[PDB]
Design a protein around this ligand. Structure first.
Ligand SMILES: Nc1ncnc2c1ncn2[C@@H]1O[C@H](COP(=O)(O)OC(=O)CCCCCC(=O)O)[C@@H](O)[C@H]1O
Ligand SMILES: Nc1ncnc2c1ncn2[C@@H]1O[C@H](COP(=O)(O)OC(=O)CCCCCC(=O)O)[C@@H](O)[C@H]1O
Ligand SMILES: [Mg+2]
Ligand SMILES: [Mg+2]
Ligand SMILES: [Mg+2]
Ligand SMILES: [Mg+2]
Lengths: 251, 251
């Protein structure tokens, strides 16, 4: 059966390219017969965003010719913290636990404010202590991963986590990304003003949720992948953009 | 001054060197966005040229102010076969002001332009193609015709209220208005529609009921240009100038 990559991005004050504000992004992986439902889902997701009404949006589909790999979601643990500063401290400890040196963590945190506007993810090289990709404000956009809702809902029931598509999306991405042999860890929180939970993820500790990573009403987010590998960055960028992943949980 | 949006679509098969299946352009208020994205989607998905494996749909705010014009006057020439239609087409182009030699040269090149995805600009002073877009063609966009007014026009005009005619006539009308455009020649690349037209400022929109045989995918869109200025000026006008059609019943 043939699957399709469906992607969306939306911005205001022009195309993202112009120097507009990123509003929303989406990526889906589906059989052809879900095309209409999926295009509408992405349209609606872009139109009803807390960051604002877009004046630019692109939606796109194409056939995927690489074969699909189906994986488990990462194990999930929720860390309850009382404030953003405690969440950020915990985040740094978790990154160090997973194998990132403290020094590389500090260098990344120096740039993170600069990367608030990035539309995808930043790749940070642990060998240089510096950004590895050259996409600048565009970022690297991981795509061609998805998680059928029914299975995701079964997973959320069991995990005592709410069945919000925001978590599905985050965990599908974290799971695809941590599977990459060159990715040691990911740090994330949302650019949406209305969601303060973030996470750190890696192969050892799984998907570590942190219930407060920033204040409500702020639009600064973070998506950094810490890279430890022997290959060029374009190889890895191609892996993240092109490798098709479906999530399927079983107990 | 109400805000309008350019909504565009293109679809192809065997990739993004692929076969062009469908193209669309709309110009609408924001509240029509959902209906319009779905219309373009469905248009692309149910095309007689085939099922796409690639599609892009895009919207953006238009910042130039909209000009509203009347549609060209319409006349329908009933012919009994394609060869009679083509012969009429050439007579009408000549009557509107294109010299015979320029018509003959263009007809010799029309077969090699079957694959062009937009329009060809043909210079009447040089008897040569003027634009440099090759297989891409020049894609006129940011024109539309609100459905209600189009339906009233079609009722009165004794022409069927098909969106194909709406789209053709909105384009022909925007294009003929351009002071450098002497005439247009058109028939569809769709295997399932053999009606075509020639259009110009004097003769209006002259429909010709048979311009090719059913089941053929060779189409034509040629703009005959009489102009001193940089072709890129004209191209920019055709791509960027926002036009709405309003037929005035009161007349
Ligand atoms: N597909 C992607 N590829 C690379 N970076 C991405 C991608 N998607 C999002 N990002 C980056 O992350 C930033 C925020 O993305 P968002 O979709 O706003 O991210 C979230 O909602 C994070 C929620 C995690 C906690 C969920 C939970 O377990 O309760 C976003 O602006 C991008 O810069
Ligand atoms: N927006 C455009 N800008 C430039 N060229 C275009 C555009 N739209 C279509 N074309 C070119 O023309 C070709 C034919 O497009 P189509 O939309 O398939 O053409 C038609 O339906 C023609 C119908 C005319 C008769 C209507 C009537 O019954 O009164 C198409 O493949 C392109 O090469
Ligand atoms: Mg997202
Ligand atoms: Mg966001
Ligand atoms: Mg068309
Ligand atoms: Mg066509």
């Amino acid at each position: 059966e043939t699957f399709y990559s469906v992607r969306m991005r939306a911005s205001m004050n022009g195309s993202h390219e112009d120097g507009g504000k990123h509003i929303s992004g989406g990526e889906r992986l589906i059989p052809f017969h879900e095309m209409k439902h999926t295009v509408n889902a992405l349209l609606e997701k872009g139109l009803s965003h807390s960051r604002g009404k877009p004046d630019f949006m692109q939606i796109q589909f194409e056939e995927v010719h690489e074969s699909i790999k189906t994986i488990q979601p990462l194990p999930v643990h929720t860390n309850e913290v009382s404030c953003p500063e405690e969440g950020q401290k915990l985040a740094r400890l978790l990154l160090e636990k997973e194998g990132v040196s403290r020094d590389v963590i500090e260098k990344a945190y120096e740039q993170i404010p600069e990367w608030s506007d990035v539309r995808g993810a930043v790749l940070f090289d642990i060998h240089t202590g510096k950004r590895m990709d050259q996409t600048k404000e565009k970022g690297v956009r991981v795509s061609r991963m998805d998680w059928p809702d029914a299975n995701f809902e079964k997973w959320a029931l069991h995990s005592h986590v709410p069945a919000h598509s925001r978590i599905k999306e985050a965990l599908a991405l974290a799971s695809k990304v941590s599977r990459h042999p060159a990715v040691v860890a990911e740090l994330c929180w949302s650019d949406d003003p209305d969601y303060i939970t973030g996470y750190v993820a890696g192969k050892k500790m799984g998907y570590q949720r942190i219930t407060a990573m920033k204040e409500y009403g702020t639009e600064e987010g973070c998506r950094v992948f810490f890279i430890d590998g022997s290959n060029d960055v374009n190889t890895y960028i191609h892996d993240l953009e092109k490798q098709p992943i479906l999530i399927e949980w079983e107990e």
